[PDB]
């Protein structure tokens, strides 16, 4: 809405500037504006969208955890609960915004495996963030929505992408985190991380130096989690 009067190219340019200035709220607003122009996003533009919202929700999640921890230790007036609720509502708002962009209409216009997997991974992640704070009647549905998005992404990535593809690797990492932290399925988490790592290792020989760097970075993050989990 507010970005309706600005050129798409200007919104992208300003998103990049906002990133350099570490103004992630601005960056997210610019990229929301760019998405709402209705055109598909390039690879670089998808990354800008992801970076922007990851930083915004990242800060909110960190704040929520601080407040939640204080709240649990307190169990004094209603202020901690009230403020935790405030941050929670704001977080849910951002997640809903991202999910809204994915549903209107990024996913349905995403035909290439790379774009579709990227957006479905995002969908899984933002349902996962909703799941982290969920308690009510729709908690199980939120979890299943995350699961469903991740699963579709996994199915496509396995068919259409090499096992070293960074998006495929990052998807597997985050889906494994979903299993461990949300779905109470640590064995599934470990299995997924292990198989992902091993299948990537076997395909490294096909890669250039630059691609090798990117793939091995994410492989190390998988290994880091396996080390923590075992």
């Amino acid at each position: 809405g507010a970005m309706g009067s600005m050129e798409r190219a200007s919104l992208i340019q300003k998103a990049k500037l906002a990133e350099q200035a570490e103004r992630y709220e601005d960056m997210a607003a610019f990229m929301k504006g760019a998405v709402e122009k209705g055109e598909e996003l390039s690879c670089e533009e998808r990354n800008l969208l992801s970076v922007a919202y990851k930083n915004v929700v990242g800060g909110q999640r960190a704040a929520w955890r601080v407040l939640s921890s204080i709240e649990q230790k307190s169990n004094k007036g209603p202020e901690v609960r009230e403020y935790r609720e405030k941050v929670e509502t704001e977080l849910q708002g951002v997640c809903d915004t991202v999910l809204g962009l994915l549903d209107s209409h990024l996913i349905k216009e995403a035909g290439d495996a790379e774009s579709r997997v990227f957006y479905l991974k995002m969908k899984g992640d933002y349902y996962r963030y909703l799941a982290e704070v969920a308690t009510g009647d729709d908690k199980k549905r939120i979890i299943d929505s995350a699961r469903s998005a991740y699963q579709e992404a996994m199915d496509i990535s396995k068919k259409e992408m090499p096992p070293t593809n960074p998006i495929r690797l990052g998807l597997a990492l985050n889906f494994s985190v979903f299993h461990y932290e949300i779905a109470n399925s640590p064995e599934e988490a470990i299995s997924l991380a292990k198989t992902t790592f091993d299948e990537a290792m076997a395909d490294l020989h096909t890669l250039s130096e630059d691609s090798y760097k990117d793939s091995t970075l994410i492989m190390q993050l998988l290994q880091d989690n396996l080390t923590l989990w075992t």
Binding site: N55, L173, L221, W229
Partner: peptide, 8 residues
């Protein structure tokens, strides 16, 4: 918690 994917 466990680390998920960071920014690139």
């Amino acid at each position: 918690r466990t680390p998920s994917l960071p920014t690139p």
